[PDB]
Amino acid sequence: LMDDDPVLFNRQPSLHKMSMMAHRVKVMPYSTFRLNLSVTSPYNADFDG
């Protein structure tokens, strides 16, 4: 998997159609997915685990 590769990304539950979206991959070290802050609100997610 490489940079700029479109990948589908989802949070459960997927109540609405933009709870699952296509993003562009950026490969970076360490063991957490990284997201922009502004897309956390449509995902209805926080970084508490």
């Binding site: 998997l1 993003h23 997915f33 997201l35 922009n36 970084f47």
Partner: protein
């Protein structure tokens, strides 16, 4: 009743924020990137890389 196959086209893990990412970008660990794979067909343009 069915068993026997090797599918590794999905992943799930914890997330964190990153202000230095675009709205459509997602950070991916190197281990997760190596675990997943994309099948690309060899052409004349992409043969070298």
């Amino acid at each position: 009743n069915l068993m026997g196959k090797r599918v590794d086209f999905s992943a799930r893990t914890v997330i964190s924020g990153d202000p230095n990412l675009e709205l459509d970008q997602v950070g991916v660990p190197i281990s997760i990137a190596k675990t997943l794979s994309y099948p690309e067909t060899v052409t004349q343009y992409n043969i070298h890389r």
